[PDB]
Amino acid sequence: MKAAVVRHNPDGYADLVEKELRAIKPNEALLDMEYCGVCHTDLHVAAGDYGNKAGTVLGHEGIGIVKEIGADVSSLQVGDRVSVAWFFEGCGHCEYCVSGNETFCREVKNAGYSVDGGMAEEAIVVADYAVKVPDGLDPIEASSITCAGVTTYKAIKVSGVKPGDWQVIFGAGGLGNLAIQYAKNVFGAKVIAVDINQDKLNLAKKIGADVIINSGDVNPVDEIKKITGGLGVQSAIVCAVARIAFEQAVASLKPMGKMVAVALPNTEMTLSVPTVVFDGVEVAGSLVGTRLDLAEAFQFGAEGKVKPIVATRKLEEINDIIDEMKAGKIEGRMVIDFT
Amino acid sequence: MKAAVVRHNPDGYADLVEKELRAIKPNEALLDMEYCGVCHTDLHVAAGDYGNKAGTVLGHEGIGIVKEIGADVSSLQVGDRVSVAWFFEGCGHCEYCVSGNETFCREVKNAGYSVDGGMAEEAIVVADYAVKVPDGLDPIEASSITCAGVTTYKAIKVSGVKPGDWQVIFGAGGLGNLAIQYAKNVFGAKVIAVDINQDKLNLAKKIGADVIINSGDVNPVDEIKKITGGLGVQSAIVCAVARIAFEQAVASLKPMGKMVAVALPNTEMTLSVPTVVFDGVEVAGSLVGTRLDLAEAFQFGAEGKVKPIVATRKLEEINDIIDEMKAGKIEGRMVIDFTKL
Ligand SMILES: [Zn+2]
Ligand SMILES: [Zn+2]
Ligand SMILES: [Zn+2]
Ligand SMILES: [Zn+2]
Numbered sequence A: 001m002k003a004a005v006v007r008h009n010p011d012g013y014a015d016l017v018e019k020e021l022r023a024i025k026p027n028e029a030l031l032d033m034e035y036c037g038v039c040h041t042d043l044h045v046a047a048g049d050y051g052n053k054a055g056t057v058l059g060h061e062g063i064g065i066v067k068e069i070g071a072d073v074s075s076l077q078v079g080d081r082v083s084v085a086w087f088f089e090g091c092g093h094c095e096y097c098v099s100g101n102e103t104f105c106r107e108v109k110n111a112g113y114s115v116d117g118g119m120a121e122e123a124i125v126v127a128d129y130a131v132k133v134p135d136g137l138d139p140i141e142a143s144s145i146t147c148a149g150v151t152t153y154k155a156i157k158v159s160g161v162k163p164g165d166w167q168v169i170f171g172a173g174g175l176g177n178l179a180i181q182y183a184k185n186v187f188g189a190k191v192i193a194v195d196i197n198q199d200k201l202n203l204a205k206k207i208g209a210d211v212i213i214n215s216g217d218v219n220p221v222d223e224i225k226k227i228t229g230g231l232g233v234q235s236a237i238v239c240a241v242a243r244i245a246f247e248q249a250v251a252s253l254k255p256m257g258k259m260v261a262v263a264l265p266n267t268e269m270t271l272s273v274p275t276v277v278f279d280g281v282e283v284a285g286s287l288v289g290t291r292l293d294l295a296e297a298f299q300f301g302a303e304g305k306v307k308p309i310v311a312t313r314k315l316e317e318i319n320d321i322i323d324e325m326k327a328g329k330i331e332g333r334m335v336i337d338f339t
Numbered sequence B: 001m002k003a004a005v006v007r008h009n010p011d012g013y014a015d016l017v018e019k020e021l022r023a024i025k026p027n028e029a030l031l032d033m034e035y036c037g038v039c040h041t042d043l044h045v046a047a048g049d050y051g052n053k054a055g056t057v058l059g060h061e062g063i064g065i066v067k068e069i070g071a072d073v074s075s076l077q078v079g080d081r082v083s084v085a086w087f088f089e090g091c092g093h094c095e096y097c098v099s100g101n102e103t104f105c106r107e108v109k110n111a112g113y114s115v116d117g118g119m120a121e122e123a124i125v126v127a128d129y130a131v132k133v134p135d136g137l138d139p140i141e142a143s144s145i146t147c148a149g150v151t152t153y154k155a156i157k158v159s160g161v162k163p164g165d166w167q168v169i170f171g172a173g174g175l176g177n178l179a180i181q182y183a184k185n186v187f188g189a190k191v192i193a194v195d196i197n198q199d200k201l202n203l204a205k206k207i208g209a210d211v212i213i214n215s216g217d218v219n220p221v222d223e224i225k226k227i228t229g230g231l232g233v234q235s236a237i238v239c240a241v242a243r244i245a246f247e248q249a250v251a252s253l254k255p256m257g258k259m260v261a262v263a264l265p266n267t268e269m270t271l272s273v274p275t276v277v278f279d280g281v282e283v284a285g286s287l288v289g290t291r292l293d294l295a296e297a298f299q300f301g302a303e304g305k306v307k308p309i310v311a312t313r314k315l316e317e318i319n320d321i322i323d324e325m326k327a328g329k330i331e332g333r334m335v336i337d338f339t340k341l
Helices: A040-047 A139-158 A174-185 A198-206 A220-228 A243-251 A273-278 A291-302 A315-326 B040-046 B139-159 B175-185 B198-206 B220-228 B243-251 B273-279 B291-303 B315-326
Strands: A002-006 A014-018 A028-037 A061-069 A081-085 A087-089 A122-126 A166-170 A190-195 A211-214 A233-238 A253-261 A268-271 A282-285 A310-313 A333-337 B002-006 B014-018 B028-037 B061-069 B081-085 B087-089 B122-126 B166-170 B190-195 B211-214 B233-238 B253-261 B269-272 B282-285 B310-313 B333-337
Touching: A002 A315, A014 A315, A028 A081, A028 A139, A040 A315, A061 A122, A061 A139, A081 A087, A081 A122, A081 A139, A087 A122, A139 A174, A139 A233, A139 A253, A139 A291, A139 A310, A139 A333, A166 A174, A166 A220, A166 A243, A174 A190, A174 A198, A174 A233, A174 A291, A190 A198, A190 A220, A198 A211, A211 A220, A220 A243, A233 A243, A243 A253, A243 A268, A253 B273, A273 B253, A273 B282, A282 B273, A310 A315, A315 A333, B002 B315, B014 B315, B028 B081, B028 B139, B040 B315, B061 B122, B061 B139, B081 B087, B081 B122, B081 B139, B087 B122, B139 B175, B139 B233, B139 B253, B139 B291, B139 B310, B139 B333, B166 B175, B166 B220, B166 B243, B175 B190, B175 B198, B175 B233, B190 B198, B190 B220, B198 B211, B211 B220, B220 B243, B233 B243, B243 B253, B243 B269, B253 B273, B269 B273, B310 B315, B315 B333
Parallel strands: A166 A190, A166 A233, A190 A211, A233 A253, A253 A282, A310 A333, B166 B190, B166 B233, B190 B211, B233 B253, B253 B282, B310 B333
Antiparallel strands: A002 A014, A028 A061, A028 A122, A028 A333, A061 A081, A268 B269, A282 B282, B002 B014, B028 B061, B028 B122, B028 B333, B061 B081
């Protein structure tokens, strides 16, 4: 079948190849893939930032139809719509997996990175680890919630935001557009959206953002303070790949505020220690979400509380999409369509 | 009334002056001070690092006997031993005061910075804010618990360490000493102490620390990973001022571990984003704590689970102490003794 894979010399791009899948194991399932979104993490994978993965099928925003199941499978049946996510399989038994924190499993398998992901006509999944897409959720939309959605939904839970609090999102990209949507429609936060791209801000404003701020036109930190009463926001979710966004996020928090890093720029950030010490502010990383996080995240999509902004593309287009993402030209997600 | 005050041109030193206090309002009390510890913060206020505070009485590690009470005061009576701490008074009604996080009050008054403190024979206090010192606690130890004590105690609370978890303390002297005592003796953590000074390490070993690591001689992060079974510690308290100590703390955290800074880095701290995200770590810091945190911190002192290193000096020696502290010659606290008898 046709698959997008990491190059023999990783350079940031995909090779399109014919691949034959091995036979399924007894707790596994075989999918006819329907859709796979392109996430910034695929690009980091393809670029070799996390080591050489030449030949690995990319993609961890996959939606597919179950074509075949192993003998031991009781959780899925043929014809089930399931997902292929960054969190592909955990060991099930470690302190992380057992305490509700399965993404941090040290023996984790990650789709499109340490195991063939979903950007191919067909994929193998471990059955009990492939979350069903609920009935009333459009498959193209489900593709975005599979990474972009569960990621930001979980990071907003990690931020400690309660309804009525001010929350700032740095980045209105595929990730940050959804973060906005969850923040406003699910968690009841008041939302500020910060980006360099006016067209993305404009869209932000239509899907939830209470206030938009272009950070090439003003100092976001100053403006954020003005908006909030002079203190700053309760939380900041960083969905921007720029160093400065992380640092502007920290300085924009009111005392006891929480910064949650979601974006993976290959970058260090400066940490204002006097800010954590005197103003009691917290900094934390959040990593996709558990199987339960994703189910909850799908369910809000199915209910229409979030509506991922999506456009379909052809597999042969993966490299055009990669350059488009690098150029910041993308609203929402581009989704590879295998139908 | 003899008082130590910020000089007219703040120069890092104190003037010793005669001061006559105003009358006390109805919700306040007047104290006869027994003890006031000399803190690194007093040296910063005196230097003008925080703005020009000329004439302000210094000191936020005070312990004193209530001498007089305002007409509205029910919480204290003449003869009570109470404290004069960094957190001197909050507004009582803002989001921070009422949610249980009063230290962050935007109208906070701090002893020895924005209000006269406890480094004088006498102090005014707002009676409801002067936490009582429990009867089994040595008053001189109490002076130090009001700052270093509550600080390290509340930091360990925000770390989330639970009994049986590994915690690493970076920097074995100063704050670290008290931090090691709370973590082992109060919270039931397994404790690693990291420092460059073997003397300090051997002492810390004496007061509970399970593993000591000379960071002068080996990479701490590597030994810590080995100690803990490969992953790292659940949390790290940073009590050292060297930047490398912060970088090692974060790098030594198991996933979802939390670093709590109690000191400030000499050069800006950096974090690696991809690691923060893939390992889900957390970095915070803590300074002093609420009146309740202070009460609990005092109480563990009174049960004899923590014991700060303290020594007494005369008010007259205040500038000598400041010189000792810049020369880095003081283990624990020098505490100004006002008492007779
Ligand atoms: Zn992703
Ligand atoms: Zn596991
Ligand atoms: Zn102090
Ligand atoms: Zn207040």
